[PDB]
Amino acid sequence: SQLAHNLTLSIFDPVANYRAARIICTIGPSTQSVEALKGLIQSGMSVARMNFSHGSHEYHQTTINNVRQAAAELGVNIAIALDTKGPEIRTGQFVGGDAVMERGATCYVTTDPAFADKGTKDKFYIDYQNLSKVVRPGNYIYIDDGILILQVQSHEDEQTLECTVTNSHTISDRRGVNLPGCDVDLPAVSAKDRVDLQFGVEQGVDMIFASFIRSAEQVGDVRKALGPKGRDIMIICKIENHQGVQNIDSIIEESDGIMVARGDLGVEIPAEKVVVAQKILISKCNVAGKPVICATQMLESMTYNPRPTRAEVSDVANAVFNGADCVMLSGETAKGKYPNEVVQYMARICLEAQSALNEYVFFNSIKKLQHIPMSADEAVCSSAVNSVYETKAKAMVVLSNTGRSARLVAKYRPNCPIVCVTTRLQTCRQLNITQGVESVFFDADKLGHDEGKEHRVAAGVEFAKSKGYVQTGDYCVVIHADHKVKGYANQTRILLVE
Amino acid sequence: SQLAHNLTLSIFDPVANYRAARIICTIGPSTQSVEALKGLIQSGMSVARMNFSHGSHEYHQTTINNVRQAAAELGVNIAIALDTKGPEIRTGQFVGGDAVMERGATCYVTTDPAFADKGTKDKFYIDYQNLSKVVRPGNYIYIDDGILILQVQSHEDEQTLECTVTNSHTISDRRGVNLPGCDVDLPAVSAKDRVDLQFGVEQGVDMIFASFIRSAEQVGDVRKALGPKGRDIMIICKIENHQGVQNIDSIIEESDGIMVARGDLGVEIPAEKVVVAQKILISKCNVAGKPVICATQMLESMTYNPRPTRAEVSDVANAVFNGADCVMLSGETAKGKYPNEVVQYMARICLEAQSALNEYVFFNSIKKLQHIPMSADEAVCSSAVNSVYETKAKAMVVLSNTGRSARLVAKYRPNCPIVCVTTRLQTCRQLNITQGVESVFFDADKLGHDEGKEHRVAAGVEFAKSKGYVQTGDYCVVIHADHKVKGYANQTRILLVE
Amino acid sequence: SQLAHNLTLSIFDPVANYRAARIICTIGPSTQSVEALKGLIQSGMSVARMNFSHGSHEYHQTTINNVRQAAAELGVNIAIALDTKGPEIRTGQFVGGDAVMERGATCYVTTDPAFADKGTKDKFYIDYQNLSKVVRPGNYIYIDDGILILQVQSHEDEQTLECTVTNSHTISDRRGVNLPGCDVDLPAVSAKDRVDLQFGVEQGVDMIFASFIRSAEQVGDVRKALGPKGRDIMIICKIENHQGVQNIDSIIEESDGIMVARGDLGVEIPAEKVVVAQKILISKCNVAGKPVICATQMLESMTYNPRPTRAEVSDVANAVFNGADCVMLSGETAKGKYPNEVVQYMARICLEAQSALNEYVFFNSIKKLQHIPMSADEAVCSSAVNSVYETKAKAMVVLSNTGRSARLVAKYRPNCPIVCVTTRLQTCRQLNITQGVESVFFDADKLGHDEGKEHRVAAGVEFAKSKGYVQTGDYCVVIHADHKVKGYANQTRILLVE
Amino acid sequence: SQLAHNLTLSIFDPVANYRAARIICTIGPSTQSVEALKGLIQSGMSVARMNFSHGSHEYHQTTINNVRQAAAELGVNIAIALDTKGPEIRTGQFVGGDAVMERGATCYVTTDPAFADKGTKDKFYIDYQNLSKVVRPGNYIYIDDGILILQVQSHEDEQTLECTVTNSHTISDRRGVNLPGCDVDLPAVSAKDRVDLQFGVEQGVDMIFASFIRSAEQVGDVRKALGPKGRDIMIICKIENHQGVQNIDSIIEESDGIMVARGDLGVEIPAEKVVVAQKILISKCNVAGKPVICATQMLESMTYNPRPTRAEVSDVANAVFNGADCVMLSGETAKGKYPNEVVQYMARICLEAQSALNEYVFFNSIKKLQHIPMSADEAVCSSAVNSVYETKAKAMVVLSNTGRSARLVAKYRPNCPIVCVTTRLQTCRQLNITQGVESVFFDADKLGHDEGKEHRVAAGVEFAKSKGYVQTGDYCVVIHADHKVKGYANQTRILLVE
Ligand SMILES: O=P(O)(O)OC[C@H]1O[C@@](CO)(OP(=O)(O)O)[C@@H](O)[C@@H]1O
Numbered sequence A, B, C, D: 001s002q003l004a005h006n007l008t009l010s011i012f013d014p015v016a017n018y019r020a021a022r023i024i025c026t027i028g029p030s031t032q033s034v035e036a037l038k039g040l041i042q043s044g045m046s047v048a049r050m051n052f053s054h055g056s057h058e059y060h061q062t063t064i065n066n067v068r069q070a071a072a073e074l075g076v077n078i079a080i081a082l083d084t085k086g087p088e089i090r091t092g093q094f095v096g097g098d099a100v101m102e103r104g105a106t107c108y109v110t111t112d113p114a115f116a117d118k119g120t121k122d123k124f125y126i127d128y129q130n131l132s133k134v135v136r137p138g139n140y141i142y143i144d145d146g147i148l149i150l151q152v153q154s155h156e157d158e159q160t161l162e163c164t165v166t167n168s169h170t171i172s173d174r175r176g177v178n179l180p181g182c183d184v185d186l187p188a189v190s191a192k193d194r195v196d197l198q199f200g201v202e203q204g205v206d207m208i209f210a211s212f213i214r215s216a217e218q219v220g221d222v223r224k225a226l227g228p229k230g231r232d233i234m235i236i237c238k239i240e241n242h243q244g245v246q247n248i249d250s251i252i253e254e255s256d257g258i259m260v261a262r263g264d265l266g267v268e269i270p271a272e273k274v275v276v277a278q279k280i281l282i283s284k285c286n287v288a289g290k291p292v293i294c295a296t297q298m299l300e301s302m303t304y305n306p307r308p309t310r311a312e313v314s315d316v317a318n319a320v321f322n323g324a325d326c327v328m329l330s331g332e333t334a335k336g337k338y339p340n341e342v343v344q345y346m347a348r349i350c351l352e353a354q355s356a357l358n359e360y361v362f363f364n365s366i367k368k369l370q371h372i373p374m375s376a377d378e379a380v381c382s383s384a385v386n387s388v389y390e391t392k393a394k395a396m397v398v399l400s401n402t403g404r405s406a407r408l409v410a411k412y413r414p415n416c417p418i419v420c421v422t423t424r425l426q427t428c429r430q431l432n433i434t435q436g437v438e439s440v441f442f443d444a445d446k447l448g449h450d451e452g453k454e455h456r457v458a459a460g461v462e463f464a465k466s467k468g469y470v471q472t473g474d475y476c477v478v479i480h481a482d483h484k485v486k487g488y489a490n491q492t493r494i495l496l497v498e
């Protein structure tokens, strides 16, 4: 039981020689410079995130170049993620630049575009043309981070809503709005996103963090916008609203992974619910074998302070316990004072939680949840991990070119490092969101196709020796195909290391 | 499994009609006024904490009077806790008021009292006379919140340590020091504490939060200082250092409960370890049936902001999941901007986590950990809870005068409110640190001794009806003695409510 | 696991001071005499069975009188069971007294009553008028213990079946027939049974072992034949054919208990299946809380020999492991050479298996299978047993007048004797089929109604002292109502014995 | 739970396409002829047992030749087992050929050899020279199958015991004696056995069923008598007395397997205990991975009747449920009326029990009991079976030359047939005592050493196709070494069948 086990823990237990969980950093003004990026990598960053809500192609290009240059200098592979601006609902302008909303007052919100540059406290524009169809009397309309809460009373006309102001707040031009009891039906991809997705393909980004995913159909639309050139880019779906949570199984099916986008989700859904949503979404991703990310306000105070709050530390740790592949940094690295320190703190917490983690229970729990039968490669991976626990093997080596084999193994939560040997560099980057995995690139061109698998295997083992995971006399559990089979791994071997 | 179960959760699940967890508030300048206190109670405060590190008997008296007056006005019983200053290690004074410590420099720390008003960056006084005996070469000496880290190189003489300065920092007069690899042997109770403990007895406080508990022997010394007059005051032991963690079983034995004092513990022990310590200590308290409190930096940002960080919310929730009876507020209520809001937020998070909580697994887990044989009353309580789950009983009533019976029941984590009927008002207050329990006072003097137990039972049931926990046709599971037995409860009944 | 546990067993483990399982003996020519019956009781008989297939009211009356006289002399209460003849299918007479059936031959079986005294190997009568409607081409018709197997080829006419003889066998007048792939639709109760049931009511028998129960409807018909005068007589349903097995849940619902009637079942169903049927039926009875009996050929060789076969000993033991309340003796006591010895052997085996029995796993297993909620009295019994395990209580006392409370407790398999205090003598007899229970009669008339329950309780405890189950300082777990509640027991107490 | 599961069973469930359990037949006058043996094999015999207590080398040779000739004709491999006479304790002769022992009488038992041909009811010879040293006053001495029970009163002298006769019985010349509370210290191997063991080596028998094994030291003595020429012959140790049961772990260590020799054990140990001993011994063998046999009186009545008793059928079934590799036939095939039928009945019961068997629980239960870590090949086998359950693989193929690999796999109880491909014919025979395994011989000489393993693998798969275990599209889980490793199998593959 989790209880009994808590009882076996000690604060003085030594931590592991490897950190399974992966850290994602958003790149902003604090972290754009190659020197800053180098600091981040050394501090522990595996994925760099660009938020297309901010900046421009020009700004983001600089980031891409800088990431590649910094990584190259440090001899490492870093995933690059494009985080779309996505569809937004905004108010228009107010006369005098500003508008003073008092509690108890009546105001009128309209989608009549005549009003975009002449709102007043009395009547102003919200730019979502379907506002009236989506909202009903009683529904709430949040403006300015959810700070100003208007309540919908009636349809003055087909484009205008009569509202009550429920609390006082001055609002300036063009605030964002939310609609918590409302199924928002903006397209999956805005016009800027479209230009945003193409750019991502062009500059060869590894993954897309797709904002605001309402549906399985929307993911497909994203896949389709990426096109043929974009087929191997991973689409990670951010769950930030009600519809996304509701549609999670279908979204998970379509996607390559999930982000638990807590900041938006937190407004959209009452905040106390975000915890249940985190546990559910992470678990469903774990069971499915797809990467899952916990995001937002994880170490927020460290945007300005050298040290985190107790609640924050607890939060990074619980996300790992929850089963997340990744934790994420937003403002703390984009605009913060202590970018290197925040990352270093997060890594340290992740390592500590990892000691407490019962990797074994996790393996068995996951294993019971799989449909039987399933697939030959899946059985190979699961049983191979079981072999790891049975022999106390100190490392694992897998051959994956797509990266599929590696996710399938990592999914089973072995208690040792997993070493993936890949013939694709992008695969090395893409695997930066999978917990517990390290990649070794094997250049097929220079070194040949390695059909008998002996070379790739030697390289993974050597890498394991090099990082100190194994010494002679240790077991290493190895996964690939035999000589005949193609397209998956049908074999496991336990080899002694010399 | 915890996994499978996460899968059954929903964000839209309705929360409970009762909140099990209890909130503790520290009373400072923001919250001293009767009006402020009334706001706190309404917001959800069950225990008011006075920190004797700050203020004076005079200041704290005002708090006591104000708490009682506010509670009286609201018709409620609020526990009063005395939080001792405890033994402190401080530096002396520096010449010019200040002293500029540079990285790489050598300085001398002495316990020679000749130096208390004439330290300099070169040599200054630390007021802990045993410093030299407790520290060895290689050990670290933290000054100013742990900001300035000196390392011990050698014993210049029997009272003076030659130190290296490991990082730059200007330090002013009389900073606190810590000794993380060091067994500090200050007495359990300072001279001020002694005057502090007596005052607490005199003003009739409910509990002591005893700072810095190193040992079982120390608790006894506290018990002894309280004296005969003080025998029914609960001693809650704060675990804030290494020795306290190491000695936890024996401390738990001696104590009436534990506090996981994260702020001090966090310096003393590396911070990433505080998480393991939290899980262990809470669990050991749950298994033992004694109240456990999670403290410090739980909603820290709310000292200054209307809304919490994501890490903070996650932290309050995980503490409940961890199994804590209580969560605590420190600065957020002592000196904060939004005292009512912070408490309201904490209560709301606690209620939400409670939905996710698997009360049933918790009951069984706890039950397996008890040694056999145990005790007739313990079996009665455990099996009575089992009855609650078996019938789906919506309330529970227990008779306790000492409060013992009530803790014993609450310990088994029923999924319904527990209603305790007590003949002692102090018991009603003392039970404010036990999760899931509500007290009804029955005035033996006015209403008689009630030996057949029918009256006390009627009152608990009526209270349950009144708060809406039960309606006619519901089961209420009831615990007390039969007609012969005295000193414990040997009986359980399932009664139908009319 | 059952495995690990087998590992903790030893042949030299001392057996218990009590035998939980109950033994049933069929009374025949060997055992009718009062002296023989006295030997049987001393040897271990708790229930005496009269088989109404044999004997007459006159013969069986002698048995009843003798049982009562023997029991009275020995100061004990013995249940009396009436085992009905039930509906039978028989052939008619053959010419010359006999008829020689050869393998490969054609013969004709008819229900034309003209043929009842003039069958021949060529054509003879079977007295079940529905034979033709119930059988189809391909079905088998067993005659003479299943020794002669005819196969049905066709309907010669509406009353006559053309058969193949599948194996050679000479058959004499009036052999029994079976129909293994056939739903036999004889009435539940024959005309003789009807006279048989009334007689049982008149002579005040404790239970009916109702032969050949096909259906829930049939049990009701039995209940109805017993009438109002017969309402408190238990109907134990013997499962001896296909339909009975198929309809077991509904039959179990209607019944007061089950017999696994292996001898008939063994012909009807292939023999290798009887094992699966035994395990299922016993388990379903255990889960339901109703008494279950394992019957037939249990110690068969002991009909003629002083000592049993290995297979036999294993069989009595496995029935206990299976979870049976009772084991039964048929021919071994009805017509056998060593009636006392066979019973003594069975008792000894039962005691030995009981040591190996994991009473605790059995308690938990049963407990998990109950639907929540269930009932206040059921929770009281289950949790009270849990109390027994938690304290290591050496005895249990329950108050039951109907005997209901006692079955409910025994159902939970405590590891100590259960002592039932009853105000009905019939209850003491009826409880002779419930494992692990001993009855003390309390004469309400002589000693009063005992509403405060103190007297009945003292008597059960004294009885426990007397048989040596408890000594001073031992715990005894006690079950009854409190002062208000009537109709069930809502209370448990753990009392110390003096 | 076993309970819940019983609930999922049905009598109409179809049985498997394979029978896991193996049947052993003792060859006597009824079964010696090649035609009889052919009938036995077809009926289901996998092992033929020769009992060297009866017959002579000459008689047994005929059996060996006949077995080989019958097997050869049927194209099958049948194991040959030599069942030793072993050490015996016998009385001497009585005057007049006979001696009439009355209850209550005093008689004298002596080891003075002067008395071997002149015993009388007054004084006679028992031929075990250590009788006096091994027995004490109070001990029992059984003569004639345990029929005549003498009790030891005193040592008349150093070679003679004064006895009471406890029950009447006429005894003739040279009856066997037992000593149930006595540690008998006959040598492991008699002089005839020695000639018996050598003969077995010479005629190339597969295994020895070693009678009466008291100790681990004794097994070694057997191993040593077999010699170098005899090194690959399996020693199966029969547990027939107290000492053997007591010393079971050490005996199991030394042995290649166990027989639960119920007929002797049943006298030696009280019969009701044989059940506990059966469960323990079988389980310990299962956990250890060594073959275990259940023996004696399993279908005894079928020595004379066409059909078994209910107790008998239950007995064969429970032995399978117990976890036995093998069931055995003794008299039923040696001297019986219906040798083919008895075997056919046993096979049928075994198949039926197999349906009820929870192979999966058995796999997991066994797996938990293994020490971790263990061995690379052991993990390969266990995890490979886990693969079978995960994919629903319908067959398994293993390469074993010693037969070791095959036992290791079978040990884990897969729910599908296991097909072993071996280069040794003796291995094919020896594997006839391992449940759930079928052997295919691959002639290394004719077909080469097959180092890449492709041929042996093709043959096992083809055999599986041929018996219908697999069709195209099915998974077959395959076990052997990779190209480098020698002496064990380090590899598992899941292959699709075409
Ligand atoms: O790229 P994924 O899809 O993970 O497939 C990798 C697996 O396929 C194989 C077999 O085709 O690749 P490879 O041909 O490169 O050797 C296995 O060796 C390898 O483990």
Ligand SMILES: O=P(O)(O)OC[C@H]1O[C@@](CO)(OP(=O)(O)O)[C@@H](O)[C@@H]1O
Pocket: B398, B399, B400, B401, B402, B403, B404, B405, B406, B450, B451, B453, B479, B480, B481, B485, B486, B487, B488, B489
């Ligand atoms: O105060 P604690 O120690 O909890 O004891 C309370 C129990 O004792 C009893 C019995 O003595 O008190 P009471 O006399 O007040 O009725 C029980 O009724 C009650 O449940």
